[PDB]
Design a protein around this nucleic acid. Sequence first.
RNA 1: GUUACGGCGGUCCAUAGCGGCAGGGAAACGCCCGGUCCCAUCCCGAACCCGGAAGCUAAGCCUGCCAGCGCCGAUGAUACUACCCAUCCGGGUGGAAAAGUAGGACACCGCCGAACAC
RNA 2: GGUUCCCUCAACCUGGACGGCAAUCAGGUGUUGAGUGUAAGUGCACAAGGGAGCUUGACUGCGAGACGGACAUGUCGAGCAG
RNA 3: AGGUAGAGCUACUGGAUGGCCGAUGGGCCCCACAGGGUUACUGACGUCAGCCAAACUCCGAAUGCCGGUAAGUCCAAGAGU
Lengths: 79, 59, 49, 136, 192, 126
Amino acid sequence: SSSRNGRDSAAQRLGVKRFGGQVVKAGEILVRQRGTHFHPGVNVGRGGDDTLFALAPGAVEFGAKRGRKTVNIVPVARP
Amino acid sequence: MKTGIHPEYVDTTVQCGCGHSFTTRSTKQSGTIVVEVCSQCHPFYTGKGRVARFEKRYG
Amino acid sequence: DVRPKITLACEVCKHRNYITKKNRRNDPDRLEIKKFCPNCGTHQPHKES
Amino acid sequence: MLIPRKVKHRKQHHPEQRGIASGGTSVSFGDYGIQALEHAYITNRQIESARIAINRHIKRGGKVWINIFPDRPLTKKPAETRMGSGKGSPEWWVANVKPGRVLFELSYPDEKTARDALTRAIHKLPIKARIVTREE
Amino acid sequence: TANIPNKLTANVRTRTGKGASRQARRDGKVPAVLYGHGTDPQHLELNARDFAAVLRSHGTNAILTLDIEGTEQLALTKALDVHPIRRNIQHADLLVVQRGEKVTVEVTVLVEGDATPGTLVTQDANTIEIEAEALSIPEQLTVSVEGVEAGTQITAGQISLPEGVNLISDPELLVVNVVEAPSAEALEEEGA
Amino acid sequence: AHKPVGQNISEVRRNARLRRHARLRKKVAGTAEVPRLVVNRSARHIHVQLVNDLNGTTLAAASSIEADVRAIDGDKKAHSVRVGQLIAERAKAAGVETVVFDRGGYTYGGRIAALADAAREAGLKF
RNA sequence: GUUACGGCGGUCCAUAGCGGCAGGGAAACGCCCGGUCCCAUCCCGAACCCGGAAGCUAAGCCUGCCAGCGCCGAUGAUACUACCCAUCCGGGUGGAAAAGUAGGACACCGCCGAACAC
RNA sequence: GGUUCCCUCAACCUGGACGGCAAUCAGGUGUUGAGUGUAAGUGCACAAGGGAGCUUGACUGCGAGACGGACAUGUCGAGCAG
RNA sequence: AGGUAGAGCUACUGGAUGGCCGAUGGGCCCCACAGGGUUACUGACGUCAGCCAAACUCCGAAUGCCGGUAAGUCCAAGAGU
Ligand SMILES: [Zn+2]
């Protein structure tokens, strides 16, 4: 007798890369995910594989819009 | 109503053996047609050659 | 091979610009398609080789 | 013997034996009950042996309720083999019992026979238990 | 029914939490809460042996009279927290009431009488809901099974209620079920 | 007594238009620099607005309720052209050069298109 | 400025929904009449589109009142837990649920436009 | 596949020639229980699901800034011009 | 930002105890067909009460992790890069 199991795949390192309050540049990756668990907000775009990246520099802020979790970028002001 | 797909439609005229006549539109190309039983003729509505031979030979 | 690799060549300059795959049972004929040709500088009809 | 018709997963981890019971700690159907006082896996064979002990004692009249079902399976690998090469095939079905859980229930016109019948069944279970009633 | 309220001495707690409640119970006390239409809860402490005496004789829905540091209050027992194993009273919710007020209360129903000898009496619903005055709650309700024959459903709509008491739960609750007594062959096929 | 059984055509028409107007708004939106031109068409009149969606405030507005538009002797399409010209005058007076057309969930063509083409040659570009 | 008025938007998007009873047509929003013209049906002027104003607020819409179903929901207590005591039980300091109870609730806010008034 | 526009299922109840639990028609309730080429998971009713018209971006030269990482690999990307 | 401990299930997928009502069925009589009841009977769906789950979730901590900030240690951690 033996086992017919024993396979698996490499961990894909998903999750949230920049948390709320972090200051980011433009084009920087924020969330890596399979579906749209988080939806794009203001100054945030959706990649081909549903990655969320920043469209403009600022500070990350998580919000909600009609029951949808969204990620927004707020423009920290110049000194 | 699309042009070149519907059957050619003609204003017709219906005639019955009891003298009752109509004027309706149908697909009959002749523009007229005769019917041997109509609303006024039928016993079910009004409540009222093989059988002609019964009264012919026997009477 | 059901889905072999095919090469699309420009009608005008005959340069081989693109390579792709098509089903040779669903599409028994040579694929005809318009793609950008760098040599001509414009979108030209391309045909399978 | 009590056996589920089907289960999605046939080989499972062992049920945890920590804490006391959250629900099922009160007598709802009958007038007398058996309340557990220890953690154990009650096998489907000890339930059959314990509800026939109640049936014999009360003879004809009365009704018996079993509030726990042997759902979760435990495996057992083939005898006289080294460790490794898979996980054993399921062999017995148990019920995870925590202290405070009420296992059996009984309705019977008189009290002396009812409490004796339930005592005959506590001696078939691998735990300590006590007889409780519907009153407070 | 007129019930003389039971007098109980209550002390306002100085410290709350789980460290202070455990210490309070170690001194023969029970934490309590007094909310209602006063709309500002009071955290009290009650004697453990005196509280249990009131519940033992006058039922679970006992009307009370708390002496909160010199102020008299009419209160009704709303809920209890009882340990499954040690069988304690870990807490007590108290609702403020005033005379002439209607409250919704669950009282217990009891089955008295001996039916036909070839029957077994099975009680499905332990308690039923009523709506009575604050100081007029019946301590218990009774039904009679005397000569009841074979399969009959005694329903919650046929319970005899005192005056000023109105049934709240629907009148189609199967409270008492009288059925034919199971035989020896019917016992061995139940639970196999 | 009487009790209606189904849904009226007006109820179906109203929810269907807002259903396909919110689909439109997933792309177009108003800004202070590029405001959104919203059109409401009815069986009798036609209304327009110039909305800034950051604040949710209306910049300019014209409608066929006005007495000047009622003086036109033409048909409904003639009233749309008058309204289309009156929104390019008020928008450019307020300081607006570019807009985006929110067709309101109606099919583009007829009264909606005549209003847009009248406001295109009058100065507003979109 | 007022309004049982019409649109465009919001809010950690139901405290806003479902259902029930009674009411409104000034301008608007609707049903409504018709298919000559732009336009349309995998058949159908039902829908989209166009041209109108005989009828009606019966429906959509709007207003008021209901706690039947949904929804929100404390305080206190408990489960759990980080650290620390504790020779196999258990306890102290800090955090603190889910369920249930008292209750809340038949939405609130912003910008334009109408008719009346000034 | 790209784009533009339109639509809302599964289930149940009721009425219908063959026809029945179930084919096609009609009316009502129905907020996602259907479906997404292909396993499972995260998603999608705002539709990423259903239908139609045109079409080849299933491009050329590039690419700020990032994810992940022993190394070699791998992945996302606004935007500029043809 | 999570989804473990816990808890909950007419909130989904499965397991599952006892009542009530009862279409489907064995049937018997409705003389054969349609034709109603009949039965310690078999009992769907629904509903009342008590439950269960690493690959269940309407919910949901304590810790841990990411970032900002004010201090502390600062003749030293003999720190970090
Ligand atoms: Zn070429």
